[PDB]
């Protein structure tokens, strides 16, 4: 399936100083999501290979 990579900081907070600090407080929620999506993306090609 199409490798979908979506950055969670940009989606959650659109160019806002206020939004970034509060997002940092949750603690890698953004970060955890990227691995799952990046892992999926690699697998789609890995699957192809």
């Amino acid at each position: 399936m199409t490798k979908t990579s979506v950055d969670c900081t940009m989606y959650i907070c659109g160019d806002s100083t206020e939004c970034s600090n509060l997002l940092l407080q949750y603690g890698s929620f953004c970060t955890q999501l990227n691995r799952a999506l990046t892992g999926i993306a690699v697998e789609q090609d890995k699957n192809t290979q």
């Binding site: 950055d7 900081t9 940009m10 990227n34 990046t38």
Partner: protein, 48 residues
């Protein structure tokens, strides 16, 4: 290791390990901050 010293240096900061193995890593997401602000308006500019 400084986070923002180098493209290489930045990679380490995200990885959080001093030695980085071969591969491709994504450090940060880049956008371009707006240079100016613009207002398109109706000048009537009437007092209340």
């Amino acid at each position: 290791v400084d986070c923002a010293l180098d493209p290489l240096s930045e990679t380490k900061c995200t990885l959080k390990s001093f030695t980085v193995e071969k591969g491709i890593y994504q450090t940060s997401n880049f956008r371009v901050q707006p240079t100016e602000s613009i207002v398109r308006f109706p000048n009537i500019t009437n007092l209340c």
